[PDB]
Design a protein around this ligand. Structure first.
Ligand SMILES: CC(=O)SCCNC(=O)CCNC(=O)[C@H](O)C(C)(C)COP(=O)(O)OP(=O)(O)OC[C@H]1O[C@@H](n2cnc3c(N)ncnc32)[C@H](O)[C@@H]1OP(=O)(O)O
Ligand SMILES: [Zn+2]
Ligand SMILES: [Zn+2]
Length: 157
């Protein structure tokens, strides 16, 4: 099994190892800390055997909606990053991480929608998001450094 808690400063070292193990977008350490500091209530880690094996890093933004047809300002949550170590996958960890963060985005930060980008070939992540009722909003052409497209995916909270 596993447990969930809010991320702390001393988790950063492990969050970074997980990020570099699982994703090509390898942010600097200060990028993680700023999100921990500013939006920490929605920033969660998954713990197995006393170690972090998964994380979700949020940002709460103010600006134009990804959902509403006409240009309108909203508080929107942004899943900047989420990852789970390979050996602990398919156990419901990312689902739980996402759910906890979405709840905090709504209850702590009063966000009314949540969004993210994901590589079009990332079927496990896309499946994960769609299972949580995210919808593909549009294709972002050449979004990634290597030129791969992303799906912008979003939903109300
Ligand atoms: C904004 C984001 O950062 S975009 C990038 C996301 N992060 C990454 O891609 C990093 C590498 N990949 C991973 O860490 C993981 O595969 C994650 C984060 C996508 C999923 O973590 P998991 O804990 O394994 O997801 P979880 O166990 O909650 O599974 C939820 C559902 O997603 C789907 N899913 C997860 N993995 C797969 C897979 N390999 N194949 C098909 N569907 C999958 C399933 O529908 C699953 O439910 P089910 O198997 O019971 O039917
Ligand atoms: Zn993003
Ligand atoms: Zn709270």
């Amino acid at each position: 099994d596993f447990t969930l808690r809010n991320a702390r400063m001393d988790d950063i070292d492990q969050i970074i190892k997980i990020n570099r193990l699982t994703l090509p977008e390898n942010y600097p350490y200060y990028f993680f800390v700023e999100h921990l500091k500013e939006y920490g209530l929605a920033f969660f880690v998954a713990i197995v055997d006393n170690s972090v094996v998964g994380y979700i890093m949020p940002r709460i933004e103010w600006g134009f909606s990804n959902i509403k047809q006409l240009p309108s300002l909203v508080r929107k949550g942004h899943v900047v990053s989420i990852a789970v170590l390979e050996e602990y996958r398919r156990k419901g960890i990312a689902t739980t991480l996402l759910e906890a963060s979405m709840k905090s985005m709504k209850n702590d930060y009063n966000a009314e929608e949540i969004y993210l980008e994901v590589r079009v070939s990332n079927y496990p992540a896309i499946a994960l998001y769609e299972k949580l009722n995210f919808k593909k909003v549009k294709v972002l052409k050449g979004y990634y450094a290597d030129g791969e497209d992303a799906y912008l995916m979003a939903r109300p909270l």
